[PDB]
Write a protein that binds this ligand. Sequence first.
Ligand code: 33B
Length: 97
Amino acid sequence: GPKPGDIFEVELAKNDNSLGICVTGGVNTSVRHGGIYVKAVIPQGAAESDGRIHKGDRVLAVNGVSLEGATHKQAVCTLRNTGQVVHLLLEKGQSPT
Ligand SMILES: *CC(=O)Nc1ccc(/N=N\c2ccc(NC(=O)C*)c(S(=O)(=O)O)c2)cc1S(=O)(=O)O
């Protein structure tokens, strides 16, 4: 598989179903690393259906936009405001599934 600490890109299509993602992190929200961790995933929502993204996975960028620094609300509203195919950048070292 990909190595731990591997930066990998996922293009998540919202083809199957609604996004059904939420995130946490930001300015030193609950999570210490402030990483934009996936907070919730709707069962068989786009992330879960795609199987690549799950809860606890950490996003850093969104279509080339460093989401780091931003608050958890922007992080959610960002996904919520993104389109069908979105380029998500994630780095390994995420929580278990
Ligand atoms: C998984 C999760 O946490 N989802 C969540 C959490 C809280 C709410 N309640 N109110 C709310 C609505 C909408 C927004 N932001 C945008 O619409 C861009 C916020 S936030 O900005 O404070 O996060 C809060 C809703 C939801 S939802 O089920 O994802 O709508």
